[PDB]
Design a protein around this motif. Structure first.
Motif, short mmCIF file in Angstrom:
data_model
loop_
_atom_site.label_atom_id
_atom_site.label_comp_id
_atom_site.label_asym_id
_atom_site.label_seq_id
_atom_site.Cartn_x
_atom_site.Cartn_y
_atom_site.Cartn_z
N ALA A 7 23.96 34.64 19.61
CA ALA A 7 24.36 33.47 20.02
C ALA A 7 23.10 32.88 21.13
O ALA A 7 22.71 31.82 20.94
N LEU A 8 22.86 33.81 22.02
CA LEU A 8 21.96 33.33 23.08
C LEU A 8 20.49 33.45 22.64
O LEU A 8 19.78 32.40 23.00
CB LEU A 8 22.07 34.25 24.37
CG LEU A 8 23.40 34.00 25.26
CD1 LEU A 8 23.51 35.03 26.17
CD2 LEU A 8 23.33 32.55 25.73
N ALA A 9 20.20 34.22 21.77
CA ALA A 9 18.78 34.24 21.08
C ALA A 9 18.61 32.94 20.40
O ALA A 9 17.19 32.51 20.42
N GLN A 10 19.51 32.00 19.90
CA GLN A 10 19.15 30.84 19.30
C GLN A 10 18.66 29.85 20.32
O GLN A 10 18.14 29.02 19.97
CB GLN A 10 20.61 30.40 18.74
CG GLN A 10 20.52 29.37 17.99
CD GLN A 10 21.80 28.99 16.98
OE1 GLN A 10 21.58 28.79 16.03
NE2 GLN A 10 22.68 28.89 17.72
#
Length: 12
Positions: A7-10
């Motif tokens: 989710a954060l990599a997005q």
């Protein structure tokens, strides 16, 4: 943990 990691990599 891994779901959130992705989710954060997005950010990018």
């Amino acid at each position: 943990a891994a779901a959130l990691a992705a989710a954060l990599a997005q950010a990018l």
